[PDB]
Amino acid sequence: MIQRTPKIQVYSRHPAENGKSNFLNCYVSGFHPSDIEVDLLKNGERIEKVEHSDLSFSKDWSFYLLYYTEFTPTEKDEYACRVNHVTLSQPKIVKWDRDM
Amino acid sequence: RLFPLRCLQISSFANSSWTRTDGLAWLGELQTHSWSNDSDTVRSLKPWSQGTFSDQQWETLQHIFRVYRSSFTRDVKEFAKMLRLSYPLELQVSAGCEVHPGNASNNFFHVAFQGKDILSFQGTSWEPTQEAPLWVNLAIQVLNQDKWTRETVQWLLNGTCPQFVSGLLESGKSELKKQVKPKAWLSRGPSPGPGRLLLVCHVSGFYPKPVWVKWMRGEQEQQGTQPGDILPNADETWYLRATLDVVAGEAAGLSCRVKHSSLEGQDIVLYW
Ligand SMILES: CCCCCCCCCCCCCCCCCCCCCCCCCC(=O)N[C@@H](CO[C@H]1O[C@H](CO)[C@H](O)[C@H](O)[C@H]1O)[C@H](O)[C@H](O)CCCCCCCCCCCCCC
C-alpha cells in the first residue's frame, strides 16, 4: 500500500579518508510500493554514475534498496542521498556524516 | 545455518497497460539470481547459480519462467477487471524451500497484493489468508480450478526446489562458509542538547551477517547501547553502528565490544 515511507541511511564502505578512494552507500528501505527515485548528491548536484542492487523486499513485504558509488571525501565537499516516493511531499534528502 | 532459498517476484501494474515484473532468488543471505524484465532470461550472479542443473534442466525451468512471467501478468490484469480492483497494482510473490538434514524439506509460496498477504499454496491447492479480503476466495475458486498450474507449482515446491537447493548448496560450499573479518573504529556523534555528546562504534566489512556489538564500557559489562540496523555493503559484507549517549565526565574508560564468527575467540575491543 502507499503507506510505508522509505527509511534512508547513508554511510561509507570505508573510514572517511580525505583524498583516499572509497564508496558511498545509501540504503533506502521499508517503503512501498516499489516505484521510487534515488540520487546521490555532491554539493547538491546528482552524481551521474551511481549503481544500485536489485530491489528486494522484507518479510513484511516492504521493499529495500542499496544505491552506491565510488567517491573521494574532502573536508569541503558534502554528499547526500536524495530520495523521492509517493508517501512523501518533498524528496527527502539525508546528508552523510563521517561520524554517524 | 539457515540456508533456505527465497525466490522473490515483484510485479507492478501502473494501469492495465503499463506493467513490469522483476525477480531475484536468495540462497541464505546471498542473492544468487536476478531476473530483470528487460531480459528474456534469469541472470546467474554466482558461478554456482546453476546448482547441479545440466544446461537442459536449467533451460526447462527458464522456459517455465519465460512462459510464467508471460502468463502471470496476463492472468493478473483479468482478475483486476473481474473482481473490479483499482489499478495501481502491486503484486509480490515469495516462493521457496529450505533443505533439512538429509531427508525432508519445507517449502512455501506466498503472494501479496498491495503489500499484504492474500493467499498462498497449501498442499496442492490455494488457500486465502488470515486477513485476506473476501473477494480473494472468488479469485481462489478460479485458481483452484486450473489443475495443471496447480500440479506444476506442487511438483516444484516438494520436488524440484529441494533437489535444486541441495545442489546449489554443495556446489556453493566454497562461498557460503566464507568468513570476512570486519574492521572497527570509533568517533563522536553530535550532542543533541545535553551538555554531553554521544559515542559511536563503527563495524564494517564482515560476512556472515550475524554480529554482536555492545558499548559495554566497563570490562564488567555495561549497558545503554543503541545498535543500528545491519546495513549492506555492495561487496557482500555489511555495516553496523552502535551508539551510546553519555556524560563526557565518565565517558572515559568506556569501550565497544565486537563479537563475530570471523573472530575466533577475540572479541574486538576499542577503548574510548
Ligand atoms: C519456486 C522455485 C522453484 C525452485 C527452482 C528455481 C530457483 C531459481 C529461481 C531463479 C529466479 C526466479 C525468481 C523467482 C520468481 C518467483 C517464483 C515464481 C514461481 C512461478 C512458478 C511457475 C508457474 C507455472 C504455472 C503457470 O505458469 N501457470 C499459468 C499457465 O497455465 C495455463 O497454461 C498451462 C500451459 O502452460 C496449462 O494449459 C494450464 O492448464 C493453464 O491454466 C497460469 O495461467 C498462471 O499464470 C499461474 C499463476 C501462478 C501464481 C498465482 C499466484 C496468485 C495470483 C492471484 C492474485 C490475483 C490478484 C488480482 C489483483
One-letter identity of residue B159: G
Please state, in angstroms and rounded to a whole number, the distance separating the CA atoms of residues B153 and B249: 64
Query: C-alpha cell of B165?
Result: 537447493
Chain B residue with CA closest to A13: the answer is B233
Contact B222, B245 (CB under 8 A): no
Contact B108, B114 (CB under 8 A): no
Nearest CA-CA distance, residue B180 and chain A, Å: 14
All domains in chain A, ordered by first residue: 1-100 (2.60.40.10)
Residue A43 main-chain phi, psi, to 5 deg: 55, 45
The atom of ligand 1 lying closest to the CA of B80 is 60
One-letter identity of residue B5: L
Give the SS3 label for residue B64.
helix
Query: C-alpha cell of B73?
Result: 501478468
Question: B201-226 burial string, b = 16+ CB within 10 Å, else e?
Answer: bbbbbbbbeebebbbbbeeeebeebe
Q: Could you tell me which of A55, A23, A43 has the C-alpha nearest to residue B92?
A: A55
Instruction: List strand residue ranges (DSSP E) for B48-136, in order.
Output: 89-99, 105-113, 116-122, 125-128
Residues paired with residue A69 on neighbouring β-strands, in sequence order: A24
Q: Do A61 and B116 touch (CB under 8 A)?
A: yes
Give the number of other CB atoms < 10 A from CB of residue B236: 14
Contact A61, B92 (CB under 8 A): yes
Q: Could you tell me which of B263, A35, A36 has the C-alpha nearest to residue A26?
A: A36
**Element of type H or E holding B73:** helix B55-82
Q: Do A34 and B90 touch (CB under 8 A)?
A: yes
Method: X-ray
Residues with CB under 6 A from ligand 1: B 7, 9, 23, 25, 33, 35, 42, 61, 64, 67-68, 71-72, 75-76, 79-80, 85, 93, 95, 111, 113, 119, 139, 146, 148-149, 152-153, 156, 160-161, 164
A66 to each of A53, B15, B28, B211, how far by Cα in Å?
5, 27, 18, 20
Q: Could you tell me which of B128, B107, B106, B104 has the C-alpha nearest to residue B118?
A: B128
All domains in chain B, ordered by first residue: 1-177 (3.30.500.10), 178-272 (2.60.40.10)
Q: Which of B185, B235, B241 sits opposite A100 (nearest CB)?
A: B241
One-letter identity of residue A11: Y
Contact B94, B112 (CB under 8 A): yes
